[PDB]
Design a binder for this molecule. Structure first.
Ligand SMILES: CCCCCCCCCCCCCCCCCC(=O)OC[C@H](COP(=O)([O-])OCC[N+](C)(C)C)OC(=O)CCCCCCCCCCCCCCCCC
Ligand SMILES: CC(C)CCC[C@@H](C)[C@H]1CC[C@H]2[C@@H]3CC=C4C[C@@H](OC(=O)CCC(=O)O)CC[C@]4(C)[C@H]3CC[C@]12C
Ligand SMILES: CC(C)CCC[C@@H](C)[C@H]1CC[C@H]2[C@@H]3CC=C4C[C@@H](OC(=O)CCC(=O)O)CC[C@]4(C)[C@H]3CC[C@]12C
Ligand SMILES: CC(C)CCC[C@@H](C)[C@H]1CC[C@H]2[C@@H]3CC=C4C[C@@H](OC(=O)CCC(=O)O)CC[C@]4(C)[C@H]3CC[C@]12C
Ligand SMILES: CC(C)CCC[C@@H](C)[C@H]1CC[C@H]2[C@@H]3CC=C4C[C@@H](OC(=O)CCC(=O)O)CC[C@]4(C)[C@H]3CC[C@]12C
Ligand SMILES: CCCCCCCCCCO[C@@H]1O[C@H](CO)[C@@H](O[C@H]2O[C@H](CO)[C@@H](O)[C@H](O)[C@H]2O)[C@H](O)[C@H]1O
Ligand SMILES: CCCCCCCCCCO[C@@H]1O[C@H](CO)[C@@H](O[C@H]2O[C@H](CO)[C@@H](O)[C@H](O)[C@H]2O)[C@H](O)[C@H]1O
Ligand SMILES: [K+]
Ligand SMILES: [K+]
Ligand SMILES: [K+]
Ligand SMILES: [K+]
Lengths: 254, 258
């Protein structure tokens, strides 16, 4: 078998085993708490339905309204600040889903916007990420020469990994302050955001109508998401991007 | 200014103007409908509170229960199938958020799982994506030679773009059938899924306890998500990936020439 064919199959076997292992661990950690919570909420639902004289249909009618009012609870999510925050979540592929296009026209424009947007954003983050690495490589060379000079890959991975921890922790500190979350919750939010996972379980600019009433904080969250993604982008550019071109290099060598 | 510095600044200016333009269009398309819906829902809330003799506190107590029961409504989301589906959404960066770790330990393991997972998944999709492109390049060369032979970039972009359309169309055909959505809704779901955006407004395997009762459909969904991402991955590898290494090539050209 060819080196590319061995590498590709190894990666497929790795990913599928990583999924089985993950599924096994996530089962062990979340199965029983979910079954416990489901039973606890069902009892809490039966108590409230009895307390306010509510039937099966009566509860269901109130259920639809509460669920439909959830995206409105955070406030106006579609003015300039709301649409700019949403535009970020699309092109950066975070996509929290806190605000999603409710109209057919909005859904169409969103698809075309992403089609051209995501490549533009990826290229931009890899270009800016490279310039940051080139600056760090120069600064470290000047530091080595200054103190009393060659910058290695290992030195770059070290600065890179610490740069990532620094941005998650700086973010965590500020989001635990403004969103009134624990440092762990704000750290988990920052991790899920900057890895473009964006579950939407934690979303910034949702409390106390921040998108409309807090301009300073909306400006910070926009700056952090974009700068933070460049730090993660620069780390992938250094560690991960080299292995992607490797498959084409071996075919070029053939 | 250096070519790299001009290119990087141009891209920053491009992205920020693309954001302003996007924000302007999304405002024009969604602002008024949202106000109309908020008003309509604000009236309904008041109507039902009056019908069933509910106070401000009484509604708020029922509000917490309805919101907390939302992830449970779909059924069991954390057994083997549900955890495997969740594991996909993490490492592929789709992250619908239909199911999210409710425990502190689950949140910790998820972070470590993503840290090593996302690079492994990205590398895997670019490696498998390249093999698909190499196979297409060989098949098209054999077809040109067979019918009556060089495979150009333009020929590859054409096959690539059509490979994206057909995958979304095959998907929309299936998800509109099983998840009882319109072709447009299922197509929009497939687009948002395969671009790793994953808003979570549309999530497959939630209706009629599909994760537990429908193993045949679950098997298809996992295979479609994974194969579909390889098709999108192969297209990015062909068109977009050639521009990312460009910034390093110009810096390599600076040191070599001087
Ligand atoms: C190629 C990409 C094309 C993307 C086009 C997306 C669809 C936009 C139109 C949605 C339908 C609007 C109908 C409606 O309710 O109008 C009444 C309401 C009232 O009118 C509007 O919403 C004003 C028209 C919005 C036009 C936005 C600018 C054009 C965007 C594409 C460039
Ligand atoms: C903290 C984050 C950003 C770092 C995560 C580590 C990655 C750099 C690792 C995780 C999985 C690794 C891959 C797992 C499996 C393989 C197959 C392996 O293939 C072989 O050994 C057979 C072919 C050959 O010998 O070339 C080559 C390395 C590679 C791509 C690995 C390259 C490095 C990867 C992407
Ligand atoms: C490379 C970096 C360091 C600089 C990038 C430029 C920033 C200074 C810009 C880019 C996006 C801008 C934001 C885009 C949108 C808004 C919303 C805007 O709020 C409203 O319009 C409120 C009313 C509404 O919702 O319509 C206030 C300014 C702000 C935060 C902007 C502040 C300035 C920002 C952060
Ligand atoms: C359907 C999808 C897969 C295709 C999306 C199109 C992309 C291939 C486009 C979208 C934005 C484009 C970028 C927009 C701006 C620039 C800056 C531009 O810089 C200059 O012209 C100045 C420097 C120089 O002359 O080298 C170089 C091309 C580049 C990176 C473009 C490369 C091609 C991109 C990524
Ligand atoms: C190269 C590609 C086309 C092949 C990849 C291998 C597939 C055949 C595997 C990979 C993941 C597998 C799935 C992983 C998880 C499940 C859930 C499992 O369902 C349960 O365990 C139900 C009860 C529970 O929820 O725990 C049934 C098999 C199925 C669909 C598996 C069927 C076979 C799949 C699609
Ligand atoms: C803050 C983020 C934006 C980063 C943009 C700035 C990038 C700077 C890269 C380093 O610049 C050059 O590097 C060369 C290396 O040989 C030096 O010779 C040269 O003197 C220096 O000018
Ligand atoms: C899933 C992906 C399928 C596997 C990828 C196959 C790639 C093409 O394989 C080789 O390509 C070479 C091109 O020069 C040919 O010479 C060779 O005969 C062929 O075997
Ligand atoms: K989401
Ligand atoms: K993503
Ligand atoms: K998401
Ligand atoms: K995402």
């Amino acid at each position: 078998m060819k080196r590319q064919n061995v590498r590709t199959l190894a990666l497929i076997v790795c990913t599928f085993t990583y999924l089985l292992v993950g599924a096994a661990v996530f089962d062990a950690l979340e199965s029983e708490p979910e079954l416990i919570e489901r039973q606890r909420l069902e009892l809490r639902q039966q108590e409230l339905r009895a307390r306010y004289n509510l039937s099966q249909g009566g509860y269901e009618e109130l259920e639809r309204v509460v669920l439909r009012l959830k995206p409105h609870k955070a406030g106006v999510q579609w003015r300039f600040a709301g649409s700019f925050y949403f535009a970020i979540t699309v092109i950066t592929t975070i996509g929290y889903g806190h605000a999603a296009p409710s109209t057919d026209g909005g859904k169409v424009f969103c698809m075309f916007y992403a089609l051209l947007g995501i490549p533009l954003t990826l290229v931009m983050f890899q270009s800016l990420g490279e310039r940051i690495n080139t600056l760090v490589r120069y600064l470290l060379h000047r530091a080595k020469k200054g103190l009393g000079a060659d910058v290695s890959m290992a030195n770059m991975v070290l600065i890179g990994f610490f740069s990532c921890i620094s941005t998650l922790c700086i973010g965590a500190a500020a989001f635990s302050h403004y969103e009134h979350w624990t440092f762990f919750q704000a750290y988990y939010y920052c991790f899920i955001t900057l890895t473009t996972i964006g579950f939407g379980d934690y979303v910034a600019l949702q409390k106390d109508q921040a998108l409309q009433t807090q301009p300073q904080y909306v400006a910070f969250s926009f700056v952090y998401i974009l700068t933070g993604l460049t730090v993660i982008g620069a780390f992938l550019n250094l560690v991960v991007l080299r292995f992607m071109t490797m498959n084409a290099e071996d075919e070029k060598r053939d």
